[PDB]
Design a protein around this ligand. Structure first.
Ligand SMILES: *[C@@H]1O[C@H](CO)[C@@H](O[C@@H]2O[C@H](CO)[C@@H](O[C@@H]3O[C@H](CO[C@H]4O[C@H](CO)[C@@H](O)[C@H](O)[C@@H]4O)[C@@H](O)[C@H](O[C@H]4O[C@H](CO)[C@@H](O)[C@H](O)[C@@H]4O)[C@@H]3O)[C@H](O)[C@H]2NC(C)=O)[C@H](O)[C@H]1NC(C)=O
Ligand SMILES: *[C@@H]1O[C@H](CO)[C@@H](O[C@@H]2O[C@H](CO)[C@@H](O[C@@H]3O[C@H](CO)[C@@H](O[C@@H]4O[C@H](CO)[C@@H](O)[C@H](O)[C@H]4NC(C)=O)[C@H](O)[C@@H]3O)[C@H](O)[C@H]2NC(C)=O)[C@H](O)[C@H]1NC(C)=O
Ligand SMILES: *[C@@H]1O[C@H](CO)[C@@H](O[C@@H]2O[C@H](CO)[C@@H](O[C@@H]3O[C@H](CO)[C@@H](O)[C@H](O)[C@@H]3O)[C@H](O)[C@H]2NC(C)=O)[C@H](O)[C@H]1NC(C)=O
Ligand SMILES: *[C@@H]1O[C@H](CO)[C@@H](O[C@@H]2O[C@H](CO)[C@@H](O[C@@H]3O[C@H](CO)[C@@H](O)[C@H](O)[C@@H]3O)[C@H](O)[C@H]2NC(C)=O)[C@H](O)[C@H]1NC(C)=O
Ligand SMILES: *[C@@H]1O[C@H](CO)[C@@H](O[C@@H]2O[C@H](CO)[C@@H](O[C@@H]3O[C@H](CO)[C@@H](O)[C@H](O)[C@@H]3O)[C@H](O)[C@H]2NC(C)=O)[C@H](O)[C@H]1NC(C)=O
Ligand SMILES: *[C@@H]1O[C@H](CO)[C@@H](O[C@@H]2O[C@H](CO)[C@@H](O[C@@H]3O[C@H](CO)[C@@H](O)[C@H](O)[C@@H]3O)[C@H](O)[C@H]2NC(C)=O)[C@H](O)[C@H]1NC(C)=O
Ligand SMILES: *[C@@H]1O[C@H](CO)[C@@H](O[C@@H]2O[C@H](CO)[C@@H](O)[C@H](O)[C@H]2NC(C)=O)[C@H](O)[C@H]1NC(C)=O
Ligand SMILES: *[C@@H]1O[C@H](CO)[C@@H](O)[C@H](O)[C@H]1NC(C)=O
Ligand SMILES: *[C@@H]1O[C@H](CO)[C@@H](O)[C@H](O)[C@H]1NC(C)=O
Ligand SMILES: *[C@@H]1O[C@H](CO)[C@@H](O)[C@H](O)[C@H]1NC(C)=O
Lengths: 105, 135, 461, 135, 135
């Protein structure tokens, strides 16, 4: 596998996407963060959908190849790392390659 | 599965001639119940008819429901035979005429009789409120 | 007066309801002998039945994007590819090298893309493999070695390597997406045109009228016309980035065919296998040379600005260029004849055409038309279905591939905001937004024929 | 000719505007009654459709059946409605609402209502048969 | 509608739970309700079976009409049953057997029982009809 970019860059309060782009045959999908090495934080509970944590600035979106996370209102937390999680090839579980995000300016 | 009585439903063949014996036994008259690739077409076309015959049979069931005769085989309601209908008389119909003759007599009044049923059924429903409209 | 309960059957109600659809096709576009491919296979025929039973007292509301059929419009053709996938040929199962700077060609070709190569580090390291003409078509030359590069075979590090051959079908067939009875599709069509609030002219249809969906990056070519007026839709109007759909009551062309006539020089290398070196000599000036009659072009754009007024009152319109990345976003993409379109469209979407009460500052066509011309790109290995990592080689072919057709709408995006100077960038965005064109006129429901109300009457007991 | 929402579902696709008179009209509306090779494949899905319509319609009529009515395109009960789900005056419902408004001002009390219908029906028809049961 | 829960119409799945228990389960099981080539050939046979299921269901439903029953799933009738063949008394039936032994207790007499249901249903109209036929 589940390829991801190493990073992308947009500036403060702007907006950007990250996506997971490999063998995304699995098509219900979830997304997660880790920041400062603390216990990982969820984002997406199914591919378009999110709970109480960051219920506005992030958004979940569908594509067959680009399992896609879309983000707006970029702030000092967005130096973190981000990961996809499709369900796997039956009775199976996966992670993406990660994306250490780099908000510039 | 089973044979045919003019149609795979409705079962004409026990014509009875006299309507008397026929009506007086109407229950038993149903209570008795390329190699081959072109077999596709020679299933399709009679399948269409077979299905549309069941749809015809459902049109009939709709009318029977409309007259308040659901599942009945002999039925009646409120409506009188009020005198001007041909005067052929009870003791002078069944014993001397046939169902095909009786249609060839009665064909005029059909929609009018059906409307009289419709009206009477719809009245019979609300007529019970003459007793039951306590609130 | 009491409230007893009563039930009714056959009563008129329909539900907003997701469901998934079959495709209806022209059963003589494909033909009896061409078995085992998607259109001859699972897509069914068509028997059109417009039957538009009209409706007083309809009051339904709509959004273009609440529809689900948009996903089927991205699906299907993966099966058309997969049922047709030509294998990796014996010359190509690894990252072979190639050496050139001027072309391996029979002539001094006056076309910028045919910078053809030998194969060099090549399987057996044998002249029978090496000396074969690697025809080029601009988008080639992945660097290997830091100087005098022995270029890498560009497909060797992605999951699909495959080939288009002249026998393999592509065609814009008239298609209809449809669903069984008890469901119905409702078409909505008040001239007060909506897709967004209520509606006031509606009826059922057994399917949409046919459509020929194919992908684009900028221009909605051969689309269905509107009528009476140009129109624009873009969801919550506070939004900046999210796509603006522009739809037209008039049309204009983009003036080039695919003019690049070439020889039938395929090479039969490997066991029952090919490389299509179909290039050289014939037509060796015939670059795509695309052109613009400013009159009808600028007319449609300035009409569009006079509509954009309605969304941005009493302040003056402007435009900015399209994105880079894959230069398809800067240009076009579409397939015609197995050949793909990439001329510099971003050269056109320009000036500060004014929306003050004005009799000037809105034209450049000069009535002389000027017939301006623009620089064009080409690709012989194509990302055969977008977003996905797949790649396919396709042959250049003899004669003229004539597609030069007309535009009925634009993909459009806003670029933030500033005092008075509102502005937009054309094309890019969600490639699904192509299929939102026309489909806004349709939605699907399930009939649900029974229900209940209170009453002042009682059943016998 | 025959009524049409689908080919026989929902006896006119067009609503009669108003939950009053249109309900009466529905009862009267029920009362009034290569090329070839892949074409032999096209002759499948409309068959599936007509079959599914029958299937749905019979499942529907079975729900009416357990509620102790059949045919009876309007039917009455002994189930109460305790003056609290919108309470709009009954003329104003009949005259100002389509069912395609009761679909929103009312609805999703449905499961409860279906419960009330079934439970009352079974309990009532047991009452008479229990009052009759002694010997 | 839904994917098949091993059995279509008839919906068999409470199989050989107690007959007494089955009445609840049953009422609930009502209350809820080559590329293209030889695979399109096959696409007739199961549909033809789908139609035959409907044919059986409707053919067999008509019988209930003759017994004066409407799919109202607990139809009852003052033909007596009168003990003397398996004699068990009430709980000793419904808490013991499966219906898949009630057949082996009793088949056979069935062919007289249908007649009892016919002639008693005709009596339950005749025995009112003759008292109206006093004038
Ligand atoms: C948008 O709209 C345009 C204009 O309407 C469409 O372009 C037309 O497409 C059709 C179908 O391809 C063309 O009609 C056919 O032309 C054949 C020759 O076509 C050349 O160009 C096509 C691309 O359109 C290539 O695929 C092909 O290889 C050629 O290079 C004819 O062979 C066809 O039959 C006629 O000729 C034969 C002999 O060759 C006779 O036997 C037949 O009887 C018959 O006379 C047929 O005419 C049409 O010419 C195109 N017009 C133009 C101006 O381009 C686009 O397809 C459409 N879609 C898109 C996305 O642009
Ligand atoms: C955008 O480009 C498309 C092509 O990519 C244009 O498509 C078609 O273009 C023509 C001319 O603009 C339109 O006009 C009609 O064309 C038909 C067919 O030639 C004519 O029908 C024929 O008319 C004669 C005389 O009355 C009669 O004898 C024939 O029997 C009759 N039928 C046939 C089959 O020949 C008709 O009269 C018009 O001249 C088409 O409507 C149009 N079709 C489609 C599907 O788009 C398109 O017009 C163009 N749009 C713009 C705004 O530029
Ligand atoms: C209703 O019943 C009548 C009679 O059975 C059906 O036939 C039509 O009857 C009238 C009246 O007899 C015919 O009109 C004229 O009658 C006189 C006297 O019989 C005769 O001298 C004239 O020559 C003329 O026939 C009428 O012509 C006749 N129709 C036909 C086509 O022969 C009538 O069809 C029945 N209608 C229905 C809907 O059942
Ligand atoms: C560039 O586009 C403009 C439109 O924006 C084209 O102008 C229009 O061209 C048509 C076809 O030649 C003209 O119609 C013809 O007009 C003559 C009389 O002038 C008449 O005899 C013919 O029957 C026919 O109707 C049309 O009038 C003209 N419009 C204007 C405002 O000039 C122009 O031809 C295009 N040029 C090129 C090189 O693409
Ligand atoms: C079904 O009956 C209920 C009452 O028993 C009706 O109202 C219920 O109201 C709440 C509050 O509006 C709904 O929660 C949420 O409301 C927001 C804002 O309206 C909306 O965006 C959310 O999607 C969500 O609906 C609650 O869901 C709703 N109950 C249901 C089951 O819809 C309701 O109007 C009746 N609905 C139907 C379709 O009959
Ligand atoms: C329902 O009716 C049948 C009679 O119609 C009852 O008896 C069963 O009848 C068959 C045919 O007579 C018996 O088979 C024969 O049995 C003799 C003597 O054992 C043997 O020589 C023959 O070769 C043949 O097998 C069958 O055994 C008999 N079954 C029983 C259990 O008696 C049947 O009993 C009736 N059902 C009930 C539950 O009463
Ligand atoms: C014509 O096409 C070129 C691309 O071939 C456009 O300009 C370049 O676009 C790429 C991709 O966005 C950029 O990386 C370059 O920096 C651009 N070059 C320049 C000098 O800006 C160009 O905008 C198009 N239009 C015109 C009028 O030339
Ligand atoms: C019955 O009464 C109507 C008037 O209500 C009259 O026209 C008709 O001739 C009478 N007889 C019959 C059998 O319809
Ligand atoms: C009736 O009263 C019950 C509580 O007894 C309540 O739940 C229900 O919403 C009320 N409305 C109707 C019309 O029955
Ligand atoms: C009921 O009575 C009949 C005679 O009327 C008798 O033959 C039968 O054995 C009795 N018992 C049952 C269970 O029918």
């Amino acid at each position: 596998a589940l390829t991801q970019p190493p990073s992308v860059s947009k500036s403060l309060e702007q907006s950007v996407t990250i996506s997971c782009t490999g063998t995304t045959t699995g098509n219900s999908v979830s997304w997660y963060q880790c920041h400062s090495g603390t216990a990982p934080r969820l984002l997406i509970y199914d591919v378009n959908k999110r709970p109480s944590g960051v219920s506005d600035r992030f958004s979940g979106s569908k594509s067959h190849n680009t399992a896609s996370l879309t983000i707006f209102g970029l702030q000092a937390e967005d130096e973190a790392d981000y990961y996809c999680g499709s369900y796997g090839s039956g009775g199976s579980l996966l992670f993406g390659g990660g994306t250490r995000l780099t908000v510039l300016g | 599965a089973v044979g045919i009585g003019a149609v795979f439903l409705g079962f004409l063949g026990a014509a009875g001639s006299t309507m008397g014996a026929a009506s007086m036994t109407l229950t038993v008259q149903a209570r008795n119940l390329q190699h081959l690739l072109k077999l596709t077409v020679w299933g399709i076309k009679q399948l269409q008819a077979r299905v549309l015959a069941v749809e015809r049979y459902l049109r009939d069931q709709q009318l029977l429901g409309i007259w308040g005769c659901s599942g009945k085989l002999i039925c009646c309601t409120n409506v009188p035979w009020n005198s001007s209908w041909s005067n052929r008389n009870l003791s002078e119909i069944w014993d001397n005429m046939t169902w095909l003759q009786w249609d060839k007599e009665i064909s005029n009044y059909t929609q009018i009789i059906y409307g009289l049923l419709e009206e009477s059924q719809n009245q019979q429903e609300k007529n019970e409120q003459d007793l039951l409209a306590l609130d | 007066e009491n409230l007893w309960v009563t039930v009714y059957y056959g009563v008129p109600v329909w539900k907003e309801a997701k469901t998934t659809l079959f495709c209806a096709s022209d059963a003589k576009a494909y033909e009896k002998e061409v078995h085992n491919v998607w259109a001859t296979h699972a897509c069914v025929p068509t028997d059109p039945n417009p039957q538009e039973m009209v409706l007083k007292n309809v009051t339904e509301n709509f959004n273009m994007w609440k529809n689900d059929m948009v996903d089927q419009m991205h699906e299907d053709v993966i099966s058309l590819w997969d049922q047709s996938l030509k294998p990796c040929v014996k010359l190509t199962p690894l990252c072979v090298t190639l050496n050139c700077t001027n072309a391996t060609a029979s002539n001094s070709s006056i076309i910028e893309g045919m910078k053809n190569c030998s194969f060099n580090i090549t399987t057996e390291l044998r002249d029978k493999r090496e000396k074969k003409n690697a025809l080029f078509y601009k988008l080639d030359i992945v660097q290997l070695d830091g100087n005098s590069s022995q270029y890498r075979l560009i497909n060797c590090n992605t999951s699909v390597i495959t080939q288009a051959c002249p026998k393999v079908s592509f065609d814009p067939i008239p298609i209809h997406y449809c669903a069984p009875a008890g469901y119905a599709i409702l078409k909505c069509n008040n001239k007060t045109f909506t897709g967004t609030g209520p509606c006031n002219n509606v009826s059922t249809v057994q399917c949409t009228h046919g459509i020929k969906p194919v992908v684009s990056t900028q221009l909605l070519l051969n689309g269905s016309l509107a009528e009476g007026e140009i129109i624009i839709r873009s969801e919550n109007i506070t939004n900046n980035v999210k796509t603006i759909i522009v739809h037209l009551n008039e049309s204009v062309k983009i003036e080039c065919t695919r003019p690049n006539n070439k020889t039938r020089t395929s090479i039969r290398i490997g066991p029952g296998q090919w490389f299509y070196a179909t290039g050289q000599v014939i037509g060796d000036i015939r670059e795509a040379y695309c052109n613009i009659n400013e009159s009808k072009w600028n007319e449609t754009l300035q009409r569009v600005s006079k509509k954009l007024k309605e969304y941005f009152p009493h302040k003056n319109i402007t435009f900015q260029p399209s994105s880079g990345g894959d230069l398809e976003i800067t240009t076009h993409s579409f397939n015609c004849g197995g050949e793909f379109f990439y001329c510099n469209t971003s050269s056109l979407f320009n000036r500060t055409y004014m929306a003050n009460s004005t009799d000037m500052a809105n034209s450049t066509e000069t009535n002389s038309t000027r017939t301006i011309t623009i620089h064009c790109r080409i690709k012989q290995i194509i990302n055969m279905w977008q977003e996905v990592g797949r790649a396919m080689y396709a042959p250049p072919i003899a004669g003229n591939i004539t597609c030069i057709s007309n535009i009925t709408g634009l993909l459009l995006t806003r670029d933030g905001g500033k005092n008075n100077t509102e502005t937009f960038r054309p094309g890019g965005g969600n490639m699904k937004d192509n299929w939102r064109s026309e489909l806004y006129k349709y939605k699907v429901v399930k009939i649900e024929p029974l229900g209940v109300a209170p009453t002042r009457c009682k059943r016998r007991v």
